[PDB]
Amino acid sequence: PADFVPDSVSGMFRSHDFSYLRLRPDHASRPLWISPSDGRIILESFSPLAEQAQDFLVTIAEPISRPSHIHEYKITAYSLYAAVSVGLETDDIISVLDRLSKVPVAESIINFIKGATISYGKVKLVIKHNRYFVETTQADILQMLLNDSVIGVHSFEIANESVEVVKKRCQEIDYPVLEEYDFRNDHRNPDLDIDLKPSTQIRPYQEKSLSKMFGNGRARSGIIVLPCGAGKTLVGITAACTIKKSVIVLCTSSVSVMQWRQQFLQWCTLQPENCAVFTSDNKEMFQTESGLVVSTYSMVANTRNRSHDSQKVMDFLTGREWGFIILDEVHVVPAAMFRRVVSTIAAHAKLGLTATLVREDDKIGDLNFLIGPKLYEANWMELSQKGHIANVQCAEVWCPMTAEFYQEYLRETARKRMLLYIMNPTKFQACQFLIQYHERRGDKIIVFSDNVYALQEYALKMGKPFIYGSTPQQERMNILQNFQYNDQINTIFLSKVGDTSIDLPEATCLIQISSHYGSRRQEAQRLGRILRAKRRNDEGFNAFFYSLVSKDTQEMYYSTKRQAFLVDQGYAFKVITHLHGMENIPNLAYASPRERRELLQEVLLKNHPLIRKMY
Amino acid sequence: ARARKGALVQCDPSIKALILQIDAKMSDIVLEELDDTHLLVNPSKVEFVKHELNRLLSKNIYNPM
Known part of the structure; x- marks a missing residue:
């Protein structure tokens, strides 16, 4: 404090009264408010000199929230690590924050800036001949590590599987590891002539993301999150063209591998003879000294007894020092052995491209250690x-x-309750009315429900195609082609097949009947399937997202938990407790009480070459 | 033409279904059922019913920390 007299109105503030910071006379031009408690930064966008501060904050801080008027950023250690790496010295950050803030920069915040910014770039992880070496420019940093000694100018070799433990331990200590690839000065790895085609244009936000990645002239391993359809694949192509080394790409589905191969051969000048696919059908590798290989997390991280050809390809991948890895959908990397794909592959630069960087467990915070x-x-x-x-x-x-229905909801176990709150007849009526209304508007509609039985029952009641796990692949393709082109099929019912990476036609309306508990990732993935519509160029066009939930159930709790991620992105979920046209729709599913009773009792009913012939 | 000491309450069928399990748990909660929307709660426990109702519906509300 600064000898500030405590007012009686400061009683309920838990030591967050920042009134001791004396307001500057020229404060009105300065758009920032620095909170000494946690380094949180409050920016006003409506003031002048806001964007000239907004770029500074997005370089040095992580944005907690970006609403329309007032933006909320977080000063954290990792943001400062990227801030100093792109050339911002310590005194420049303090001088600009002092110049651009109303309240003075507190000494605790300044000391945090000095502490996080200094002792950076000391310890570095380098790869020499498919062998991980941790290197430090100062001698005694090797001798101060005596606890997690996994040893097997000043540098010592560590094991390939122990690199994550070293990164965690050095992050706990005040010496974070520097992971930068100087591909310009790297000559042991053979170069590639990969370059973008001149006909391909790159959007400014993609350019900003890649300028964050390649700011200092050296490739920095990290994570990039972009919305679905915003061109994260093109960002991967451009990063590969920037590094110009051997590229390995990991995906979650074989169709994603096919799409990544198609995008590589389309946007950039890479010959198909430099491209290799490691899938079940295709296992032939490129014979050149450098190239691109694309595969799946499951095959690379397969602990089971793999085939001889796949073993040979895995030996080729492990024995080759890769210059770049692109991990698509990096939110599944923190899994059990999807974690190990950074250890089994010696890659200088690691770029993780995602759209949904959330998990319900805390292991999503381990990607800074992994990637x-x-x-x-x-x-x-x-x-x-x-x-x-x-x-x-x-x-x-x-x-x-x-x-x-609600009487049976309370006298039941949670597993049967899950099925029972989905199949309430009012949700049937609401889904039917929304389908009819948005079909009259001429919208392609996807109805998502993770419950397979509910999906089938809704589709049979409403006469629409349904796609789930046991549907044959050719039937799925025929149904999707009818959805894309036939105008009599504007509604498709999709299970968790549509949540994961499968190719879908463009849709403008989504109705979420059910969900997998409080999965924020699935919610944002479902929202991402209507975010790339062709009608975005049309003025006044809006896509629609409906989450049909049963009132006074646990579906409300899980629905709010799923919506907690999208309100962080800025989306506002307006509640709809009334639909105009409920009483005047021609056909209502389960309107009569006897039909509802029959539906309820149906839901409750759910739960020696010669002797060989004789045998 | 007899008189009792009770309180008439208005509720949707969901809350109506909720408070019958309160009767099944604690005996002196409701005396008899009138309609699908009108119930007769004993006035000595109505606030207590309130004191559990927001507690009973708290499982349906997600509270961030």
Whole structure:
């Protein structure tokens, strides 16, 4: 404090009264408010000199939230690591923050800046001949590590599997590891002539993300998150063209591997003879000294007894020093042995491209240890207002549960309760009315429900195609082709197949009947399937997202938990407890009480070459 | 033409279904059922019913920390 007299109105503030900071006379031009408690930064966008501070904050801080008027950023250690790496010295940050803030910069914040910024770049992880070496420019840093000694100018070799433990331990100590690839000065790895085609244009936000990645002229391993359809694949192509080394790409699905191969051969000048695919059908590798190989997390991290050809390809991948790895959908990297794909592959630069950087467990905070610091956040409202992604109208329809259904809801176990709150007849009526209304508007509609039985029952009741796990692949392709082109099929019912990476036609309306508990990742993945619509160029176009939930159930709790991520992106879920046209729709599913009773009792009913012939 | 000491309450069928399990748990909660929306709660426990109702519906509300 600064001898500030405590007012009686400061009683309920838990030591957060920052009134001791004396207000500057020229404060009105300065758009920042620095909080000494946690380094949180409050920015006013409406003032002048806001964007000239907004770029400074997105370089030195991580944005907690970006609403319309007041933006909230976080000064953290990893943001400062990327801040000093791109050439911002310590005194420049303090001078600019002092110049651009109303309240004075507190000495605790300044000391945090000095402490996080200094002792950076001391310890470095380098790879020499498929062998991990941790290197330090100062001698005694080797001798101060005596606890996690995994030893097997000043540098010592560590084991390939122990690199994550070293990164965690050095992050606990005040010496974070520097992971930068000087591909310009790297000559042991053979170069590639990969370059973007001149006909391919790159959007400014992608350029900003890649400038965050390649700011200092050296490739920095990290994470880039962009919305679905905003061109994260093109960012991967451009990063590969920037590094110009051997590239390995990991995906979650074989169709994603095919799409990545197609995008590589389209946007950049890479010959198909330099491209190799490691899947079940295709296992032939490129014979050149450098190239691209694309594969899946599961095959690379397969602990089971793999085939001889796959073993030979895995030996080729492990024995080759790769210059770049692109991990698509990096949110599944913190899994059990998807964690090990950074250890089994010696890659100088690691770029993790994602759209949904959340998990329900805490292991999503381990990706800075695995891949690297979170390099770029895409502002989804900033991309929506520029037409790069669709302008979705997120909504949450409250479906009240009927009397006979809610009585059975309370005298049941949670597993049967999950099925029972989905199949309430008011949700049937709401889904039917929304389907009819958005089909009259001429919208392609996807209805998501993770419950397979509920998906089938809704589709049979409403006469629409349904796609789930046991559907044959050719039937799935035929149904999707009818959805894309036939105008009589504008509604498709999809299970968790549509949540994961499968190719879908463009849709503008989504109705979420059910969900997998409080999965924020699945919620944002479902929203990402209507964010790349073709009609974004049309003025006044808006996509629609409906989350049909049963009122006064646990579905409300899980729905709020899933929506907690999208309100962080800025989406506002407007509640809809009334639909105009409920009483005047021609056909209502389960309107009569006897039909509802029959539906309830149906839901409750759910739960020696010669002797060989004789045998 | 007899008189009792009770309180008439208005509720949706979901809350109506909720408070019958309160009767199944604690005996002196409701006396008899009138309709699908009108119930007769004993006035000595109505606030207590309130004191559990927000507690009973708290499982349906997600509270961030």
